[PDB]
Amino acid sequence: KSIYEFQVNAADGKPYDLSQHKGHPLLIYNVASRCGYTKGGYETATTLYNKYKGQGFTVLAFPCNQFAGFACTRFKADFPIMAKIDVNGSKAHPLYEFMKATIPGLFGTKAIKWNFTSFLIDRHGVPVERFSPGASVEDIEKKLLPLLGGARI
Ligand SMILES: [N+]
């Protein structure tokens, strides 16, 4: 079981080539589609994407208007933004049900609670880590640096 058994549209609204990232770690974030504290999670995402993309790594942002409790200037980033999805409820994306079921917020139901929650994916496409929006760059590197070689050899 891996993320590569799910299909997803990209921002342009057409099917995204998810499998191009197979055999390399990847971080997947939920981000607000509208306004989005561009400090914190956003700067960790961008930092990691720039420090590590060169070696196969990417960050994927799934816009989601589920935690705004029609605003600002629409999410922008250097990494791949996907088509807006729901991450919780009867219409959540099975990709998100898969990752949330694989790694829950202990209780919290497993539900996504915050924007800029991320999941780290291994070379095989298995979610191995769930980070909170306030996780630092270093805190993500502790788990990620032993994946930029796969976890082997
Ligand atoms: N998507």
Structure obtained using: X-ray
d(CA 13, ligand 1 centre) in Å: 8
Class of domain 1-153: alpha beta
CB 130 within 8 A of CB 103: yes
Q: Catalytic annotation on 64?
A: no
Tell how far the Cα of 6 is from the centroid of ligand 1, in angstroms: 10
Among protein residues, the one with the nearest Cα to ligand 1's atom 1 is: 83
What token pair was written down for 38?
Answer: 């561009």
Q: What's the per-residue H, E or C state across the chain?
A: CCHHHCCCEECCCCECCHHHHCCCCEEEEEECCCCCCCCCHHHHHHHHHHHHHHHCCEEEEEECCCCCCCCCCCCCCCCCEECCCECCCCCECHHHHHHHHHCCCCCHHHCCCCCCCEEEECCCCCEEEEECCCCCHHHHHHHHCCCCCCCCC
Catalytic residue among 35, 68, 101, 145: 35
Domain residue limits, the chain? 1-153
| Resolution value, angstrom units | 2.3
